[PDB]
Amino acid sequence: GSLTEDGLSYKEKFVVRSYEVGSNKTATVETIANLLQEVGCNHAQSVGFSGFATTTTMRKLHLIWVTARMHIEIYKYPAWGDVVEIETWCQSEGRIGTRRDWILKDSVTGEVTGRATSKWVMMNQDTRRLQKVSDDVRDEYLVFCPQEPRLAFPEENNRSLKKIPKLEDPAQYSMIGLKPRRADLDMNQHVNNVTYIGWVLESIPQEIVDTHELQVITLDYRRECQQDDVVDSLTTTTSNDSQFLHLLRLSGDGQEINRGTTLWRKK
Amino acid sequence: GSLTEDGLSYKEKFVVRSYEVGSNKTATVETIANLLQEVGCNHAQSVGFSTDGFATTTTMRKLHLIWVTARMHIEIYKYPAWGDVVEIETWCQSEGRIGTRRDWILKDSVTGEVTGRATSKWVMMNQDTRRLQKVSDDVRDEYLVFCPQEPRLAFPEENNRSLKKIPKLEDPAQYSMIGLKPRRADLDMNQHVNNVTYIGWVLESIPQEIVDTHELQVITLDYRRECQQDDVVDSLTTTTSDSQFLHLLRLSGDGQEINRGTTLWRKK
Ligand SMILES: OC1CN(C(c2ccccc2)c2ccccc2)C1
Ligand SMILES: OC1CN(C(c2ccccc2)c2ccccc2)C1
């Protein structure tokens, strides 16, 4: 992997592994999400950042970046043995937070096979209190972002910015008692963001997965699942194409941890 | 990755990823086990097998036969750090009619030093009836040309840990993790639970304080029966001692054994 010529974006190639693919012999959306995370971490390391990606001022103030939303659109899932090239960049969104975008390409054809965007907010590591980005923090990372707008999702009222409603009981489908194991944790012992994507997908019936391809997934992150928490995954059909509304909540008290939507195309 | 000069082994380099490491910023034993599988699959593809979901010969496909893991044994001296490059070499050997063995050697790409080693036993099974069998001469002739003829063992030492008999854990277990269920990410391309998931489930019943203060040195795992996608598992562990543990995975309902194993840990 390497920063591009202008030093404002980062590119990396990956060979799709045998254990990374599903029944169709193509990468799962969770393998894609892991690759997006890996290339994001390699971009942060290349420009001088570090268990968390933080600036000097962020470390002094016990501040970290946390994902608020992840949005992924896949046109073609790379096959086992295929090489996928991923380009990533970040942009400041004023005082609200930051955005990281990605473009996925087939290395042989040069064709765009997917795109993704994510919203990140600043949080105090200890109190969990969200906050706006300060000028002092903003000055430390603006030199690594393009100054002119560069968007993976330029479209007028595109799906990546759509408000997601709260699923109403009773859900059409559910998967109950989901618990993270050690492999679900990151190096800081927090549940990996990609685990939540897997849990959302667990309540989609196997017949939809066997006859459809996942085209778009939008996921909001409201609260973290702790290592000793238990989750229930809920799904209701809202719709050639099938659309679903999703909700992850704690098994006991029903506290919301995530909400999302998925769009699927008939194979 | 590539076959070596003589065409009797295969080598591949891997850069350890951010999501592949634990609290110590080094690869987990499950990341290592996944890499061992990946290099094994790439070795099979390079010599003309697979491109269907299973590594099979022409005669195996005609007879609906597949290779299934009977035992996995891994010994790690140093876990590669995040960003480090690990080189893995693998090869296979026929063990007569019993089955086959695949071995691995792990090395730090910068120093050339051996950082780990692994060995696995594989048996032939009819994929529809699940009935185990010996390896026929016709099947053995199709894969013997891809194996070294003289013995080449990752674990040569007489009566080494990789060949030790593992006893069955007696109730009550000292520790347990109950109600473990596979999700879609735990499945392989044939919708079977990935062998590495069972390693993760075994490790789930080890208390977090042992993991925080010890490094896993050796793990031996026997595979007795597969966990189906709709099955639920209980992971049981008892200290037998360095720290040593005896492990047992069984179905949550009827208590049918799916795996048994042992782990050896060194105080950090
Ligand atoms: O997910 C978003 C991408 N942002 C980082 C980032 C920004 C520009 C280039 C590389 C990396 C970051 C900003 C400020 C402190 C530490 C890391 C956070
Ligand atoms: O996991 C064990 C090792 N595998 C062998 C094997 C694979 C398919 C058919 C016959 C034999 C082997 C693979 C690649 C080179 C040489 C032998 C099955």
From Swiss-Prot, chain A:
EC number from the UniProt entry: 3.1.2.14
GO BP, sorted A to Z: fatty acid biosynthetic process
Membrane-spanning residues: none
Subcellular location: Plastid, Chloroplast
Keyword annotations from UniProtKB, A to Z: Chloroplast, Fatty acid biosynthesis, Fatty acid metabolism, Hydrolase, Lipid biosynthesis, Lipid metabolism, Plastid, Transit peptide
Function, in words: Plays an essential role in chain termination during de novo fatty acid synthesis. Possesses high thioesterase activity for oleoyl-ACP versus other acyl-ACPs. Substrate preference is 18:1 > 18:0 > 16:1.
Family to which the UniProt record says this protein belongs: Belongs to the acyl-ACP thioesterase family.
UniProt name for this protein: Oleoyl-acyl carrier protein thioesterase 1, chloroplastic
Source lineage: Eukaryota, Viridiplantae, Streptophyta, Embryophyta, Tracheophyta
Gene that this polypeptide is encoded by: FATA
Residues represented out of the complete protein: 75 to 359 of 362
